[model samples]
Structures are given as structure tokens and as C-alpha cells.
Target: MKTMIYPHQYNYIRSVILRLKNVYKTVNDKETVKVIQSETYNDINEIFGHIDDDIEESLKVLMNIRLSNKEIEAILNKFLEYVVPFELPSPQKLQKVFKKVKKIKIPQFEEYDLKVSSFVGWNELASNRKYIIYYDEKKQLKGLYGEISNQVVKGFCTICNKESNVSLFMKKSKTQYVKKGDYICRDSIHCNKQLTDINQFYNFIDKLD
Candidate 1:
């Protein structure tokens, strides 16, 4: 079967395991636990809804009250099997997207890390600059280039919608050379983890203009 799970879907799949662990660890009433288990099964089904595989066979272990932490962890580890990793853009294609950028520091990450990320990002410390590259809904590669401020202040990031140490990211609008700035996570790799919906990143892109 094709790898149908997106990064955000993988996040939800992991959360299903976490909820089950909590139910087993804390819940006392047998009926209540059963209710939570059935509800969790339905919840997880939504994430893997497209698949034809016997999900019950693979996920039934999660509902087992005697499930060990090791078993729980093993189930979580298998979630990667359904996730599709990000494919790297060629140097030629990247050059066309990030035109006028000389010696850009391309982001380096493992396939698994890219599987969880909303976007690929890196910073050039000497120039106090940052760059972001991500795929739009149409699967087109888009690059955003900006200058980052030296001061790292604790603030809300527009991309992941999380509170983190952020820097002022300034860029010029296309219509005019007017500078615009917004607070974004100083370390975008970390920011990617906080992001559960890819639309949140797209929404951040819309505010750029």
C-alpha cells in the first residue's frame, strides 16, 4: 500500500498511544476504561481511514489493559511505517526558487526528522538571516528568505502557533521595498515539532505580505 500518512496524521497517531497509556495507568473503573478504549479505537481509525489493512489487528494491543510500556513504545515506533518522508529538492530546482541567494545553507536532517517537519529551515548566523523551504498544497516547492534579528525574545511564533524563543524576521514585500517583520521561532526545527496542522504554516505564509 502507498504511504498515505502525512506528518500531522503521524502526530495524531502518536497521541492515540499516549491517551491509551494514560487510561491504563490512571483509570480505575473497568467500564470507564472500556469506554475510553473503544473511543480511542474510533479516534485512531480516522487517522488511518484511507488504508484497507486490518487496523484492528495492529492496534488491538493498545486496548489491552496489561500492556507494558515497552509494548506501548513498540506500537508507537511502528507508526513511522505509514509516514512518507520528505523528498529533497535538487540543487538546480532550489537555485531557481531561492534566486539571488548566494551560498545558502541548505538544511540537513534525517529522513525521519523530515517526516515530522512542516518545513525545512536553517539560519546563517554571520548574516543574521534565516531561510525556509516547504511544499504548498499543490506540491510546489516554495522558499522564503528573510533577515533575523540578533535579539532572541520569548514570544509566540506565527508558524507553529507556539510560544518559543523567537526572533524578528524581516522581509521586503514584492510590490514595494517596504520592510515587514513578524515573530517566528528562532529554531524552526524545534518549531516543526509543535506544528500539528500544515495549514497553520500556510496561514503564516499568507501573513507575510
Candidate 2:
């Protein structure tokens, strides 16, 4: 049949394995390091049994390739930057209005250029928690707030559609209630980073409430 994973998904998995390899190597555990590397690839095959043969072969080759720690770090950093680059907010002083609210403020929204066609927005709502917003091609601002889930299950991110170590979250109404909840990748901060029309995103949040 057809492959169950996509190009972006494959790239995400590759990055995860490479990062894990780096951590293990840093600990000076070559044996467990190699074991983890092998297990990572094996898990990929087992989880995505119907993956593309060509890509599967490519992954095997990539795993075998050796590079300096600097090279590996650079690669991972670049991957992270491309997937979820950092962006600036308007200013903390100008963001006082949202200090006690769960919703985005008008000033902060404008400060971050949520109306512009630039890129996605990432804001650390609290320790181990974050809020991510993006303007679809339609110029519609879509956003969500989530916290890191230490316990990740085998599933794809609802936002980026990536199958990885994801965080569980939900859209809470003004009354502090959950309308619906789902899991998403912890690192894919801007997973829903897609361009769309204006007001399209606002309507999405409105519907939830």
C-alpha cells in the first residue's frame, strides 16, 4: 500500500534520533548510545512499517554517517530554526494587559505582527508552558496554548501532523473548561504554521468558545 508517513514526519523522526544520539554520546556511554541508535531506527521501521522503501534506505545510510559534534549540533540547530524559529514580541511593558488573561491582547497581537504575512509566533506562557500563533496564507490568526507533557503516547501531533514525543493539551473556554483536547509535538511549536485568509483563525477560536 502507500506509505503512512510523510516527508516532514520523516525529517522530524531523523532529527529526534540525531538529538538522542548526541545526548547519549555526551554522557560517554558508547555502548548504550549505539544501542539507542539502533533502537531508534528499529522503532521507526516498526512504527511506520509501510514507509517508503527509498526513504527507509536513506535513513539507514544517514544513521551510519559519522560527523563531528559541532557538525551535528549545527544540523540540529538549523533544523530547529527552520521548523520553529524564534520571534520577538512587541515588549513586556506593552504586554501588561495579557498578564492575567488566557487570551491574546490586541496590542501584543499587533506587536507580534499577527496580521502580517511574516511567520509563526511562539510565546512562553509559563514555565514548561507555551502559546503558539500563526497566520494562515489567508491572513487568519490561529493560535493555541499548551504545556509540556512528560508522558507522551504513540500518536501524531494534531497541529503539525508529526508522529513524535508529543504534548497533550486542549482548548479551554473563557469559563475555564475544555471543549476538546488532543496531543501535539512538544518541539513543533509552530505546528499549525500555515498561511490562510484573514479572520479564518479568529473564527476557529470563536467556535471553540
Candidate 3:
């Protein structure tokens, strides 16, 4: 099968399938069970329009039992066969994206696990700076940069909508400083693992002031 699922969408499906498995264990009512099934299928259909019957059936069967983590992981691993891995653009291309920054440090792309990411994100520890490059609603590659605090603390991350080791990202706009009053993950690769929804990420970038 041609790769049809993005990495973030794959994460979303895993979480949704896991939620359904949990509901199977805790929910007693058949009506509630049916509703959850409906929700799960709806999300699946929305993200993956008309998937393979085997894959679709896998989700149905997986939900029938309270799955062990290893079992679920095996299923997810199988699911990865259909997922499209992330690819980095050329360094020249990225250079154009973040052209505003002089001496931008572009890391060796293979060093980071981008398969779990919806965007490209990295930090320059020596400069105490972070860079983000993601597709906008229009599918344009937009870039942003900011100062990342040295100290890491636990907080809600705007990117992944989960609690993580976060630090304040201070970006100076034309008229004011912008941090979105929210802390973001200091370890972006870890953050990407938790990003199951790409819309939250787009909105996070959209609201930058």
C-alpha cells in the first residue's frame, strides 16, 4: 500500500485505539460502548479515508480486549508499515526559511528522529536558542525562532498539548515580546512523540503574537 498516514496521525490513531481499549475495560453500558466505537471509527475515517480492511479490522479486534502494552505496541508497529516517515528539506531550503537568523546552526538531519514530528524543531545549546519550521494552514513552510530559558521545568507544552520538561520561549516581535504565556517542551524530539493532534500544533503557531 502507498504510504497514506502521517506520523502525527498515526499517533492519534494509537491514542484513540488505546482509549477504546480502556473504555472496554471500564464502561459497562452497551450504548456507551457503541458510542465510543462510533467515535473511534469516525476519527479513523476522518484521518484515513477508507483504510485497508485488515488494518481497519485490526483496530476493531484490538478494542475487543483490554490490551497489554506490549500487544498494543506490536499492533502499532504493524501500523507503522503504512505510515509516511518525516523527511527534511534541503539545508539550502531551510536556510531560506530561517534566513533572518545569521549563523543559524542546522544540525545533521539524520541525528534527530523526525518520524514522530509534524514539524522540524531543534535548539542551539551554545546560543540558548530554538528554531521551528512547520507548515502553516496554507501548507507553506513558516519559520520561527526564540530564546529558550536554560532551566527546564514541568509545564503544559503549546506544541503537543501535553505536560513536559518545558522552558519559556521568548520571541521578540516588532512591537512586543511574545512567549504565548505558555512553556513548551525543551526536548522537542520527546515532544513530537506526544503530538497526536496536528491541529493543536498549527494553532500554536497561528497564535504567535
TM-score winner: 3
Q: For candidate 1, write residues 1-209 as lDDT tens digits.
A: 74478876776677667878888999899998888888888777777775345466557787788878888667767777778766678988888898888765476677778888778888887877788898899999999888988899998888777789998998777753777768989998788767777887888787777
Candidate 2 vs 3: which has more lDDT = 3
Query: Candidate 2 on 1-209: residue-level lDDT in tens?
Result: 44443223334454556666565547565777677767766766664675466546544554653645565554433323223222344545224424654455432333223222233434353545545554445644445554555676767655545466666755555564555556655544234332222243344344545
Clashing residue pairs for model 1: none
Model 1's number of clashes is: 0
Cα lDDT tens digits, model 3, 151-187, are 8888889889888899987776655343543578998
Off by over 4 Å in 2: 1-87, 92-128, 136-144, 189-209
User: Which ten residues in a row are the worst by lDDT in model 1?
Assistant: 50-59
Residue pairs in candidate 2 whose N, alpha carbon or C atoms collide under 3 angstroms? 136-194, 136-195, 136-196, 137-195, 137-196, 138-196, 138-197, 138-198, 139-196, 140-197
